[PDB]
RNA sequence: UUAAUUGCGAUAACGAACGAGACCUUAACCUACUAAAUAGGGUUGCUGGCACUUGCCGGUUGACUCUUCUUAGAGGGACUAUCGGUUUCAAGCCGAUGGAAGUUUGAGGCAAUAACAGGUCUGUGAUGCCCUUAGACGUUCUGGGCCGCACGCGCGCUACACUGACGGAGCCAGCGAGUACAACCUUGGCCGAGAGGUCUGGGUAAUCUUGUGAAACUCCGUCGUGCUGGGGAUAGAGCAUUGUAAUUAUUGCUCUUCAACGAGGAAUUCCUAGUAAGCGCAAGUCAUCAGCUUGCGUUGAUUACGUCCCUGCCCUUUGUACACACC
């Protein structure tokens, strides 16, 4: 009955799934509200999707996230990519396009990935050296 | 409203819980207090000295609330951390078992922890009351 | 039983690896390419592809009848669960393992070093092949390390199209 | 025939052995193989191992 | 299933390493069917190079 | 360093010489006409024929070419 | 640490702290930096000019070298020293090593001109 | 030991004299005058936060910046 | 021009093969197919507590149904695409725009002819012949050594602390591995200041260990620029464990012993992006022993984006009294 689209973002192995609904305005992270997060200095990064477009958009939409994988700081990107898509999925389906297109071009000027998935994955460590490129120390004395 | 444990911050949750226990002084004391290292690898004893156990017992109670059933060996592995084993790389080994066990044994008689099936320790009905009352008290401190 | 699936899959490979090694020794005189095992319910079909088929079977069940009893005592099995057949080979030219046995005979008998290779290279093209290569090594006349080569046609050395196409076969000989 | 003709050889390097000849060095015991690392390269594809990457 | 190994039969020259590995595909098809119908499907549908096995107990 | 190989240009000359019809400007339509006639094994090598054939169509409107 | 450096500048004579940071980048970027030319064997230094990212990339590095060396065995932890380096460069005092390391290379080019 | 760590009652008079009206007030600032060296400066600064006097900006261990109460 | 005898163009040269490129494996993209109580989510029930209105946190593999994550079949997606400059305005290279992806899209796997008297007879019932062939250089049991200590070089670990150490509090990964004829990984509960004792399991393994809640990190306190609370070496006594056996400290733990070293002289090695360098984890050997090697994921820069000055490699043109070839 209620509008439900299962948006998800991804930075490295850190994945997050934002199940949006219609109601009062919840933006919870692992049960707790938006203002925890828990890196503590990077609380300001999680607001960036909210403060650009505005809090007026979230008055109808109710989001809640479960984050797993990666580390501490990598999971903040997973939340931020999930919430950014969470609006677009709602505004694409059941709202006019001109609002949703203003979200797109707003996030291009402050493009810290947001909608776009990041390219970098880890690369194998090959034999003979302490890393991929880094080789062992030689001696011919 | 929606009064839950998650609205209160995790670090700030234990401060109100610690002072709540010290008023009564009915959580019980084992006997090994301040004759203690704290972990298997830790040069200095507890700096807090007095109190101390009431900080530990509060943080054990809130973790038993969130999860299904927590045990002794897992709590030692969770609290325990790094070492300095001479001139080698730093390893990880469990903390003190005797401290974390008597937290769980004493909290049963006070009225928080319950004996669960399969294995571990889950929460009682009266245990959820004291967790929410202190959470509601911490909500009043902020608001 | 009850054993894990990773352990039995590796143990299946070594079981065959033993069987392939002994038939190299035992069927040296009668010709031998390889063995193909197919474990059906209860019984097991062991198909030995060889040149001289009737000699591998023997005198109406003698060579294979004795060899079936050997496999039981090695790997612990009953009379009925194993059946050693003998089928013909799909040509000699493409199946490169067959040429090594013929070459092994020609050196042990006392035939020419170079002209044995000139004979077999033609036979590879006569069957229907693209190219060929026969590298003989060791002290071929005089007391020093030497090598030979008698190639023909196109021979591809790299890429994944290598394992499928090129049939290889190494087989050592003495002599004095 | 003689009484003392053994040692407690239920552990270590001396008791353990390969299937082929019996070398007490470079022994692969992973997955219960017991084939030394010189002969494993020879018999890799027959068992089913391949150099994919 | 990996077994990393040095290439040499002695251990001289340059130091090089391999990754000889064995793959293993694994499937499950759970029937809610009668007893004797499993005796039909097990006899047929066998092709060499595949490990057939049935539990017949939940 | 994306210099196209000889085996790509073997097909690119042979296709355009005979089939000048069924070749018009864009990648996607001309890409469907490469696998049509020829029998290429891989995807990578098949699509690389479509790349250089389509590039010659851009030049053909600005005069001819040798060969 | 970078947040704590900006909090110091906000207290000192009000001011937007990025105005002190940007002016520090201007006053620690060398005009002329000589490249070691051979011409036989000896290390004669020809006067080559510097623009534009090389003025910015060197200047930001020289501030952090002067900042961290000042807080090597010291109560005055990095944030206090880094804040002082930017004030000295913005208000050209000829004391901070962001300016001195820039000024001492000026200078070397004109000798071989 | 470079002195100025030992507790003296004569110094405690002069701490309250030089407390008010300053731009920079921290653990980094007081040690430059050769006052209570190291940790006893932190305890001296902890007194000045209780009854107003000097009000805070940052609240971290190792980064403790304060400014005068206007 | 290219990473490349890679291609354009010039022509006693015309077409061809091998090597490279193509091929194969792995890492990304798919709300479209095909699917699952050994993967996770929603509807809801039964229920436990909570703010007392609709709603918040749940505990059960009670029911119903499904595929965003998740595994893996089967396909597509990339072709320098489309434009702008720049070139016999050729082959390419460089600036935008679209795009998850624009260095061969990242990294490996396979690897030509021709050689070196490079390594292995200490992997071998792969092996020529010489030695050794019972008073045995075959053997077999038992003590001892491969680790002796004025002295050199080679990889390495931990430090020369305040971007730090010592306390609590917060609390997140991925590669793996694992017994039934042995003694494997081993949660939960009691004993213990530790190490480790014991009762029980579960697991032949996306089912149980296991969410392998691992470190570095985060955030308030304790010390503050003194060989110091930094650092941990030498030392002595006992308590544990694996072994037929630990004295030539096997290994870990408990108090004491508390040094050397205030950023390293000539020299010198490795390195262009999820890389470098911190950081631990797993496996390999393994009765018991990582300061090692091979693999994985967290934290994630500065600085080129060019050149033959140095050290060596490929061709052409020149000279040779060299050809087991400037040793």
Swiss-Prot record, chain A:
Compositional bias ranges of the Basic residues kind: 132-141
Pfam family, one: Ribosomal_S9
Any one of the GO BP annotations: maturation of SSU-rRNA from tricistronic rRNA transcript (SSU-rRNA, 5.8S rRNA, LSU-rRNA)
GO MF term list: RNA binding; structural constituent of ribosome
Region (Disordered): 121-141
InterPro entries documented for this protein: Ribosomal_Su5_D2-typ_SF, Ribosomal_uS9, Ribosomal_uS9_CS, Ribsml_uS5_D2-typ_fold_subgr
Family: Belongs to the universal ribosomal protein uS9 family.
PANTHER family the UniProt entry points to: RIBOSOMAL PROTEIN S16, RIBOSOMAL PROTEIN S9
Keyword Ribosomal protein tagged: yes
Keyword Hydrolase appears in the UniProt entry: no
Protein name, UniProt field: Small ribosomal subunit protein uS9
A cellular-component GO term for this protein: cytosolic small ribosomal subunit
Keywords carried by this UniProt record: Ribonucleoprotein, Ribosomal protein
Highest classification ranks of the organism: Eukaryota, Fungi, Dikarya, Ascomycota, Saccharomycotina
Swiss-Prot record, chain D:
One biological process term in Gene Ontology: cytoplasmic translation
Keywords (A to Z) from UniProt: Ribonucleoprotein, Ribosomal protein
Gene3D superfamilies: 30s Ribosomal Protein S14, Chain N (4.10.830.10)
Database matches in InterPro entries: Ribosomal_uS14, RIbosomal_uS14_euk_arc, Ribosomal_uS14_sf
Assigned protein family: Belongs to the universal ribosomal protein uS14 family.
Residues passing through the membrane, by range: none
Record-given protein name: Small ribosomal subunit protein uS14
GO CC terms: cytosolic small ribosomal subunit
MF-aspect GO terms: structural constituent of ribosome; zinc ion binding
């Amino acid at each position: 009955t209620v509008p439900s689209v299962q948006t998800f973002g991804k930075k490295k192995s850190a994945t997050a799934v934002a199940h949006v609904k219609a109601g009062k305005g919840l933006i919870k992270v692992n049960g707790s509200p938006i203002t925890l997060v828990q890196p503590e200095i990077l609380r300001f990064k999680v607001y960036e999707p909210l403060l650009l477009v505005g809090l007026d958009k979230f008055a109808n939409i109710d989001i809640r996230v479960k984050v797993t994988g990666g580390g501490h700081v990598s999971q903040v990107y997973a939340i931020r990519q999930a919430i950014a898509k969470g609006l677009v999925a709602y505004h694409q389906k059941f709202v006019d396009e001109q609002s949703k297109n203003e979200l797109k071009k707003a996030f291009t000027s402050y493009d810290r990935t947001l909608l776009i998935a990041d390219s970098r994955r880890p690369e194998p460590k090959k034999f003979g050296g302490r890393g991929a490129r880094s080789r062992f120390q030689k001696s011919y004395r | 409203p929606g009064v839950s444990v998650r609205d209160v911050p995790a670090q700030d949750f234990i401060n109100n819980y610690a002072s709540f226990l010290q008023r009564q002084g009915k959580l019980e004391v084992p006997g090994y207090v301040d004759i203690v290292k704290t972990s298997a690898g830790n040069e200095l004893p507890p700096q807090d000295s007095e109190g101390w156990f009431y900080k530990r017992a509060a943080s054990v109670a809130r973790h038993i609330y969130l999860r299904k059933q927590v045990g002794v060996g897992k709590l030692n592995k969770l609290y325990g951390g790094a070492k300095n084993r001479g001139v080698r790389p730093h390893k990880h080994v469990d903390a003190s078992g005797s401290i974390n066990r008597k937290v769980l044994q004493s909290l049963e008689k006070l009225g928080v922890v319950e004996i669960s099936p399969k294995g571990g320790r889950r929460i009682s009905d009266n245990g959820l009351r004291d967790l929410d009352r202190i959470a509601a008290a911490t909500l009043e401190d902020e608001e | 039983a009850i054993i894990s699936k990773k352990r039995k899959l590796v143990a299946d490979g070594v079981f065959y690896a033993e069987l392939n090694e002994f038939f190299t020794r035992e069927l040296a005189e009668e010709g031998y390419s390889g063995v193909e095992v197919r474990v059906t319910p209860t019984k097991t079909e062991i198909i030995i592809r060889a040149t001289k088929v009737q000699d591998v079977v023997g005198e109406n069940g003698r060579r294979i009848n004795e060899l079936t009893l050997l496999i039981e005592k090695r790997f612990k099995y009953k009379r009925g669960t194993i059946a050693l057949y003998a089928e013909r080979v799909h040509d000699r030219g493409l199946s490169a393992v067959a040429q090594a046995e013929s070459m092994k005979f020609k050196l042990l008998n006392g035939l020419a070093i170079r002209r044995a290779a000139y004979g077999v290279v033609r036979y590879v093209m006569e069957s229907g092949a693209k190219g060929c290569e026969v590298v003989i090594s060791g002290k071929l006349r005089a007391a020093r390390a030497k090598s030979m080569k008698f190639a023909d046609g196109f021979l591809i050395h790299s890429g994944q199209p290598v394992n499928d196409f090129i049939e290889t076969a190494t087989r050592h000989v003495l002599l004095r | 025939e003689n009484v003392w003709y053994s040692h407690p050889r239920k552990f270590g390097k001396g008791s353990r052995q390969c299937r082929i000849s019996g070398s007490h060095s470079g022994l692969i015991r992973k997955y219960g193989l017991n084939i030394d690392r010189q002969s494993f390269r020879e018999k890799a594809n027959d068992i089913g191992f391949y150099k994919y990457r | 299933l990996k077994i990393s190994t040095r290439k040499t039969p002695n251990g001289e020259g340059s130091k090089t390493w391999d990754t000889y590995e064995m793959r293993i595909h694994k499937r499950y098809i759970d029937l809610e069917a009668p007893a004797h119908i499993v005796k039909r499907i097990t006899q047929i549908t066998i092709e060499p190079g595949v490990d057939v096995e049935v539990i017949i107990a939940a | 360093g994306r210099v196209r190989t000889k085996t790509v240009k073997r097909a690119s000359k042979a296709l355009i010489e005979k089939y000048y019809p069924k070749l018009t400007m864009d990648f996607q339509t001309n890409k469907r006409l490469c696998d049509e006639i020829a029998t290429i094994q891989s995807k990578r090598l098949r699509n690389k024929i479509a790349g250089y054939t389509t590039h010659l169509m851009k030049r053909i409107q600005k005069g001819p070419v040798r060969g | 640490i970078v947040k704590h450096t900006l909090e110091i500048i906000n207290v000192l004579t009000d001011q937007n702290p990025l105005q002190v940071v940007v002016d520090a980048i201007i006053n620690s970027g060398p005009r002329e930096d000589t490249t070691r030319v051979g011409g036989g064997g000896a290390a004669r230094r020809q006067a080559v000019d510097v623009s534009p990212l090389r003025r910015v990339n060197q200047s930001i590095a020289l501030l952090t070298i002067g900042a961290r060396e000042a807080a090597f065995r010291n109560i005055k932890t990095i944030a206090e020293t880094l804040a002082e380096e930017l004030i000295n460069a913005a208000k050209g005092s000829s004391t901070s090593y962001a300016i001195k390391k820039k000024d001492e290379l000026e200078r070397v080019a004109k000798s071989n001109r | 030991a470079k002195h100025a760590v030992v507790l003296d009652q004569d110094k405690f008079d002069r701490i309250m004299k030089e407390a008010p009206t300053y731009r920079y007030v921290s653990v980094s600032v007081l040690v430059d005058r050769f006052k209570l060296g190291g940790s006893l400066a932190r305890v001296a600064l902890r007194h000045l936060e209780n009854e107003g006097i000097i009000k805070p900006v940052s609240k971290h261990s190792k980064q403790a910046i304060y400014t005068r109460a206007t």
